[PDB]
Design a protein around this motif. Structure first.
Motif, PDB file in Angstrom:
ATOM      1  N   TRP A  29       0.847  -1.189  -0.011  1.00 46.71           N
ATOM      2  CA  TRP A  29       0.195  -0.348   0.005  1.00 46.71           C
ATOM      3  C   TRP A  29       0.944   1.428   0.295  1.00 46.71           C
ATOM      4  O   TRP A  29       1.317   1.593   1.012  1.00 46.71           O
ATOM      5  N   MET A  30       0.945   1.632  -1.162  1.00 47.63           N
ATOM      6  CA  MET A  30       1.894   3.138  -1.412  1.00 47.63           C
ATOM      7  C   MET A  30       1.062   4.144  -1.048  1.00 47.63           C
ATOM      8  O   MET A  30      -0.066   4.399  -1.672  1.00 47.63           O
ATOM      9  N   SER A  31       1.811   5.230  -0.398  1.00 45.07           N
ATOM     10  CA  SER A  31       1.235   6.421  -0.065  1.00 45.07           C
ATOM     11  C   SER A  31       1.895   7.428  -0.099  1.00 45.07           C
ATOM     12  O   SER A  31       1.978   8.484  -0.929  1.00 45.07           O
ATOM     13  N   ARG A  32       3.229   7.515   0.851  1.00 44.45           N
ATOM     14  CA  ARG A  32       3.841   8.638   0.872  1.00 44.45           C
ATOM     15  C   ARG A  32       5.138   8.485  -0.027  1.00 44.45           C
ATOM     16  O   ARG A  32       5.428   9.578  -0.708  1.00 44.45           O
ATOM     17  N   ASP A  33       5.491   7.277  -0.462  1.00 43.03           N
ATOM     18  CA  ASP A  33       6.917   7.204  -1.123  1.00 43.03           C
ATOM     19  C   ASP A  33       6.449   6.628  -2.712  1.00 43.03           C
ATOM     20  O   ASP A  33       6.519   5.305  -3.102  1.00 43.03           O
ATOM     21  N   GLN A  34       6.275   7.620  -3.662  1.00 41.45           N
ATOM     22  CA  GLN A  34       5.744   7.363  -4.926  1.00 41.45           C
ATOM     23  C   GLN A  34       6.784   7.308  -5.906  1.00 41.45           C
ATOM     24  O   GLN A  34       6.933   8.216  -6.620  1.00 41.45           O
ATOM     25  N   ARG A  35       7.487   6.244  -5.897  1.00 38.96           N
ATOM     26  CA  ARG A  35       8.730   5.963  -6.745  1.00 38.96           C
ATOM     27  C   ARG A  35       8.936   4.449  -6.853  1.00 38.96           C
ATOM     28  O   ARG A  35       8.645   3.635  -5.753  1.00 38.96           O
ATOM     29  N   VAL A  59      -0.651  -1.304  -4.540  1.00 41.28           N
ATOM     30  CA  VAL A  59      -1.947  -0.383  -4.411  1.00 41.28           C
ATOM     31  C   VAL A  59      -1.883   1.147  -3.912  1.00 41.28           C
ATOM     32  O   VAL A  59      -1.103   1.373  -3.172  1.00 41.28           O
ATOM     33  N   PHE A  60      -2.562   1.840  -4.734  1.00 47.21           N
ATOM     34  CA  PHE A  60      -2.735   3.281  -4.183  1.00 47.21           C
ATOM     35  C   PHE A  60      -4.284   3.641  -4.255  1.00 47.21           C
ATOM     36  O   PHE A  60      -5.200   3.272  -5.112  1.00 47.21           O
ATOM     37  N   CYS A  61      -4.602   4.347  -3.029  1.00 44.79           N
ATOM     38  CA  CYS A  61      -6.089   4.935  -2.909  1.00 44.79           C
ATOM     39  C   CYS A  61      -6.257   6.242  -2.861  1.00 44.79           C
ATOM     40  O   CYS A  61      -5.719   7.031  -2.129  1.00 44.79           O
ATOM     41  N   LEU A  62      -6.784   6.751  -4.095  1.00 43.36           N
ATOM     42  CA  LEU A  62      -6.997   8.251  -4.469  1.00 43.36           C
ATOM     43  C   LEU A  62      -8.031   8.803  -3.476  1.00 43.36           C
ATOM     44  O   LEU A  62      -9.426   8.298  -3.747  1.00 43.36           O
ATOM     45  N   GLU A  65     -10.263  14.272  -1.123  1.00 41.13           N
ATOM     46  CA  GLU A  65      -9.851  15.436  -0.426  1.00 41.13           C
ATOM     47  C   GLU A  65      -8.499  15.132   0.829  1.00 41.13           C
ATOM     48  O   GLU A  65      -8.513  13.933   1.203  1.00 41.13           O
ATOM     49  N   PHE A  66      -7.495  15.796   0.769  1.00 43.89           N
ATOM     50  CA  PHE A  66      -6.407  15.400   1.633  1.00 43.89           C
ATOM     51  C   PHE A  66      -5.830  17.203   1.904  1.00 43.89           C
ATOM     52  O   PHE A  66      -4.947  17.504   1.424  1.00 43.89           O
ATOM     53  N   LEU A  67      -6.034  17.357   3.259  1.00 41.53           N
ATOM     54  CA  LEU A  67      -5.410  18.518   4.010  1.00 41.53           C
ATOM     55  C   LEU A  67      -5.540  19.441   3.220  1.00 41.53           C
ATOM     56  O   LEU A  67      -4.393  20.419   3.096  1.00 41.53           O
ATOM     57  N   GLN A 130      -4.990   7.671  11.341  1.00 39.13           N
ATOM     58  CA  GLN A 130      -6.534   7.084  11.233  1.00 39.13           C
ATOM     59  C   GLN A 130      -6.713   6.145  10.127  1.00 39.13           C
ATOM     60  O   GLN A 130      -7.625   5.185  10.569  1.00 39.13           O
ATOM     61  N   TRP A 131      -6.313   5.996   9.148  1.00 40.16           N
ATOM     62  CA  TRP A 131      -6.251   5.169   8.118  1.00 40.16           C
ATOM     63  C   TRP A 131      -5.710   3.831   8.480  1.00 40.16           C
ATOM     64  O   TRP A 131      -6.458   2.769   8.396  1.00 40.16           O
ATOM     65  N   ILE A 132      -4.683   3.934   9.279  1.00 34.69           N
ATOM     66  CA  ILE A 132      -3.919   2.403   9.597  1.00 34.69           C
ATOM     67  C   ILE A 132      -4.761   1.991  10.659  1.00 34.69           C
ATOM     68  O   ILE A 132      -4.853   0.702  10.371  1.00 34.69           O
ATOM     69  N   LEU A 272      10.493  15.538  -3.321  1.00 31.51           N
ATOM     70  CA  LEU A 272      10.925  14.871  -2.098  1.00 31.51           C
ATOM     71  C   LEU A 272       9.527  14.634  -1.279  1.00 31.51           C
ATOM     72  O   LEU A 272       9.108  13.523  -0.664  1.00 31.51           O
ATOM     73  N   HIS A 273       8.487  15.495  -1.294  1.00 36.70           N
ATOM     74  CA  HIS A 273       7.307  15.629  -0.464  1.00 36.70           C
ATOM     75  C   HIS A 273       6.440  14.413  -1.075  1.00 36.70           C
ATOM     76  O   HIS A 273       5.841  13.718  -0.285  1.00 36.70           O
ATOM     77  N   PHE A 274       6.279  14.365  -2.379  1.00 34.90           N
ATOM     78  CA  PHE A 274       5.668  13.216  -2.933  1.00 34.90           C
ATOM     79  C   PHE A 274       6.570  11.763  -2.939  1.00 34.90           C
ATOM     80  O   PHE A 274       5.783  10.746  -3.716  1.00 34.90           O
ATOM     81  N   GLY A 411       3.972  20.926   0.535  1.00 34.79           N
ATOM     82  CA  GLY A 411       2.904  21.215   1.632  1.00 34.79           C
ATOM     83  C   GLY A 411       2.477  19.932   2.110  1.00 34.79           C
ATOM     84  O   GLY A 411       2.675  18.848   1.723  1.00 34.79           O
ATOM     85  N   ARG A 412       1.543  20.081   3.059  1.00 37.21           N
ATOM     86  CA  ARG A 412       0.831  18.965   3.842  1.00 37.21           C
ATOM     87  C   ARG A 412       1.988  17.792   4.481  1.00 37.21           C
ATOM     88  O   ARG A 412       1.812  16.784   3.838  1.00 37.21           O
ATOM     89  N   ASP A 413       3.023  18.321   4.880  1.00 34.02           N
ATOM     90  CA  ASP A 413       4.199  17.485   4.931  1.00 34.02           C
ATOM     91  C   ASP A 413       4.846  17.883   6.488  1.00 34.02           C
ATOM     92  O   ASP A 413       4.741  19.128   6.747  1.00 34.02           O
TER      93      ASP A 413
HETATM   94  O1  LIG Z   1      -2.504   7.709  -0.538  1.00 32.84           O
HETATM   95  C1  LIG Z   1      -2.582   8.720  -0.851  1.00 32.84           C
HETATM   96  N1  LIG Z   1      -1.719   9.743  -0.458  1.00 32.84           N
HETATM   97  C2  LIG Z   1      -1.808  11.128  -0.895  1.00 32.84           C
HETATM   98  N2  LIG Z   1      -1.039  12.012  -0.700  1.00 32.84           N
HETATM   99  C3  LIG Z   1       0.345  11.737  -0.206  1.00 32.84           C
HETATM  100  C4  LIG Z   1       0.679  11.960   1.298  1.00 32.84           C
HETATM  101  O2  LIG Z   1       1.963  12.489   1.113  1.00 32.84           O
HETATM  102  C5  LIG Z   1       0.541  10.728   2.106  1.00 32.84           C
HETATM  103  O3  LIG Z   1      -0.541  10.307   2.005  1.00 32.84           O
HETATM  104  C6  LIG Z   1       1.143  11.002   3.542  1.00 32.84           C
HETATM  105  O4  LIG Z   1       2.262  10.884   3.600  1.00 32.84           O
HETATM  106  C7  LIG Z   1       0.366  10.032   4.573  1.00 32.84           C
HETATM  107  O5  LIG Z   1       0.878   8.586   4.190  1.00 32.84           O
HETATM  108  C8  LIG Z   1      -1.267  13.303  -1.234  1.00 32.84           C
HETATM  109  C9  LIG Z   1      -0.233  14.398  -0.950  1.00 32.84           C
HETATM  110  C10 LIG Z   1      -0.449  15.645  -1.247  1.00 32.84           C
HETATM  111  O6  LIG Z   1       0.601  16.712  -1.033  1.00 32.84           O
HETATM  112  C11 LIG Z   1      -1.566  16.004  -2.023  1.00 32.84           C
HETATM  113  C12 LIG Z   1      -2.589  15.134  -2.254  1.00 32.84           C
HETATM  114  C13 LIG Z   1      -2.549  13.674  -1.922  1.00 32.84           C
HETATM  115  C14 LIG Z   1      -3.509  12.738  -1.968  1.00 32.84           C
HETATM  116  C15 LIG Z   1      -3.098  11.338  -1.698  1.00 32.84           C
HETATM  117  C16 LIG Z   1      -4.144  10.370  -1.960  1.00 32.84           C
HETATM  118  O7  LIG Z   1      -5.390  10.416  -2.475  1.00 32.84           O
HETATM  119  N3  LIG Z   1      -3.679   9.133  -1.552  1.00 32.84           N
END
Ligand SMILES: O=c1nc2n(C[C@H](O)[C@H](O)[C@H](O)CO)c3cc(O)ccc3cc-2c(=O)[nH]1
Ligand SMILES: Cc1cc2nc3c(=O)[nH]c(=O)nc-3n(C[C@H](O)[C@H](O)[C@H](O)COP(=O)(O)OP(=O)(O)OC[C@H]3O[C@@H](n4cnc5c(N)ncnc54)[C@H](O)[C@@H]3O)c2cc1C
Length: 463
Positions: A29-35, A59-62, A65-67, A130-132, A272-274, A411-413
């Motif tokens: 389950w990929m979320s933070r580290d998209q590479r 797997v990735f879940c879009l 809304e995210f922060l 919260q997701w975890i 780095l953020h993504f 941001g959101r970091d």
């Molecule tokens: O797993 C996801 N991570 C998303 N991320 C990644 C985010 O970095 C991670 O979800 C957190 O690090 C928590 O795992 C986003 C980051 C942004 O800056 C903006 C939008 C998103 C949207 C998602 C998302 O839909 N799903």
């Protein structure tokens, strides 16, 4: 279970839920580290799969809304993912796509896809916790977490909140010999899944990236000022950006990193953020470069110490986005000055539109609005004036976080929460001379900036 291997340090992985391994695939389950390159979470997932003799899948879940992210961030992210699909497919690693709340969706996918093991990457943000929690309540297979973002796993670098860079730095540096290492190559799958209601990332991208953008974002803000051409998304582009930094900017970084009229920063932060590039990778390549020792030391302290202490801050302070996360001296000082008369009180909307009396502040906001990346020096100035020209420290923190999270590509970091907390609340700083409104929080005046760089030129550029 998690097998031994070259460059596979088991301290990078821990069990969120121990249990009985199923016969099915290992799901990352990929979320933070998209590479796909230099990704310990993917590498561990692949190793777990190899030991179990099953395939690894991603797997990735879009989330829609995210922060407070808008179209500018979602599009950058999704364009990255489009490239990632190709990289993963070249390694024979299937990629699946879900939409909605990852809490619900990931646990349902684990059932529907008959996963035998679940692995995710590490984030200290509340939303990931919260997701975890929701996923754990809905699965009956082992669930691991891998720190793929930090050189030293966050829970290893320190057992507690570090009050200063100078207390974190010796702990982190002592662990670099163990953890600052090369990455092994990701081995392609050799076991075939051959495997309904599950859509692939490929499938969902057949009609383009725009079709996937959150509707609610576009409706809330058309984002007329954003200029998308400054940062091209994806792993390949991140690598180009790192290579150009090292070749053209690193030598001057130490002298010019605090001059916002010079483009001498790495520009790596969105990547780095993504997690489109590894900070561990960047550190390894900078270490190999022949450049000014002063510049290398300065750059490495930022991407190692300040970046990893931001994960430390969020991980050990669950209220990291709140006044109560501030050090006691700062809360005491700001409390004592709560009733001081403010010279200005701006609404969220006035700050957002860059409609203050201060043209340097406005220009900083315009750089953010136009490019999605404010120079690091003016970020400090910018957040500190939000404190100065708000009704309360709480309101200031709310506004700074909101604008950072709405508009910064990076941001959101944790780096943002920690930087805003440093700026407004003295987190990881010291007390300075006492003033009205701001108390002992470090002050940065307009005239002080004028003494340090060509303020007129920066204002002109973002007018
Ligand atoms: O797993 C996801 N991570 C998303 N991320 C990644 C985010 O970095 C991670 O979800 C957190 O690090 C928590 O795992 C986003 C980051 C942004 O800056 C903006 C939008 C998103 C949207 C998602 C998302 O839909 N799903
Ligand atoms: C009010 C405020 C808000 C901030 N918001 C964010 C944010 O949302 N996201 C974000 O990544 N950074 C944030 N920072 C930290 C820093 O300003 C940015 O990381 C940096 O400007 C990004 O540009 P760059 O990658 O070109 O930087 P470079 O100077 O080339 O640094 C390289 C990398 O090192 C790390 N780094 C550098 N400076 C810092 C720092 N001060 N703290 C933590 N890590 C650092 C980042 O990962 C950065 O990408 C914030 C700082 C402040 C004062």
């Amino acid at each position: 279970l998690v097998p031994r291997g070259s460059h596979m340090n088991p301290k990078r992985i821990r069990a969120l839920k121990s249990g009985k391994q199923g016969d099915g695939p290992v799901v990352y389950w990929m979320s933070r580290d998209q590479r796909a390159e230099d990704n310990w979470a993917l590498l561990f997932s692949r190793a777990i799969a190899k030991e179990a003799n099953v395939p690894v899948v991603v797997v990735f879940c879009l989330t829609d809304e995210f922060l407070e992210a808008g179209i500018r961030q979602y599009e950058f992210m999704l364009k990255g993912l489009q490239e990632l699909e190709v990289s993963l497919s070249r390694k024979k690693i299937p990629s699946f796509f879900l939409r909605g709340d990852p809490g619900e969706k990931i646990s349902r996918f684990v059932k529907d896809y008959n996963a035998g093991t679940l692995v995710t990457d590490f984030s200290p943000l509340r939303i990931k916790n919260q997701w975890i929690e929701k996923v754990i309540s809905g699965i009956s297979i082992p669930f691991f977490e891998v720190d793929a973002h930090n050189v030293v796993p966050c829970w290893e670098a320190s057992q507690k909140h570090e009050y200063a860079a100078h207390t974190f730095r010796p702990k982190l540096y002592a662990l670099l010999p163990e953890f600052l290492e090369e990455f092994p190559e990701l081995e392609p799958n050799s076991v075939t899944p051959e495997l309904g209601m599950v859509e692939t990332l490929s499938d969902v991208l057949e009609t383009g990236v725009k079709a996937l953008l959150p509707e609610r974002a576009l409706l809330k803000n058309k984002d007329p000022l954003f200029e998308p051409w400054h940062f091209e998304p994806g792993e390949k582009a991140a690598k180009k950006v790192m290579e150009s930094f090292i070749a053209d900017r690193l030598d001057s970084y130490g002298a010019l990193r605090n001059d916002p009229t010079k483009n001498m920063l790495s520009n790596l932060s969105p990547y780095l953020h993504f997690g489109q590039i590894s900070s561990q990778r960047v550190v390894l390549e900078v270490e190999k470069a022949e450049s000014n020792p002063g510049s290398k030391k300065a750059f490495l302290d930022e991407i190692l110490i300040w970046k990893e202490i931001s994960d430390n801050f969020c991980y050990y302070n669950p209220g990291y986005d709140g006044f109560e996360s501030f050090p006691s001296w700062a809360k005491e000082s700001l409390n004592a000055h709560r009733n001081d008369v403010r010279s200005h009180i701006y609404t969220l909307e006035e700050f957002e539109a860059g409609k203050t009396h201060d043209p340097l502040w406005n220009a900083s906001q315009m750089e953010l609005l136009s490019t999605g990346k404010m120079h690091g020096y003016t970020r400090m100035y910018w957040a500190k004036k939000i404190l100065e020209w708000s009704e309360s420290p709480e309101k200031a923190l709310e506004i700074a976080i909101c604008l950072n999270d709405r508009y910064e590509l990076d941001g959101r970091d944790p780096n943002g929460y920690a930087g805003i907390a440093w700026s407004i609340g003295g987190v990881h700083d010291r007390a300075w001379g006492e003033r009205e409104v701001t108390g002992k929080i470090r002050y940065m005046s307009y005239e002080g900036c004028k003494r340090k760089f060509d303020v007129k030129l920066y204002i002109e550029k973002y007018s």
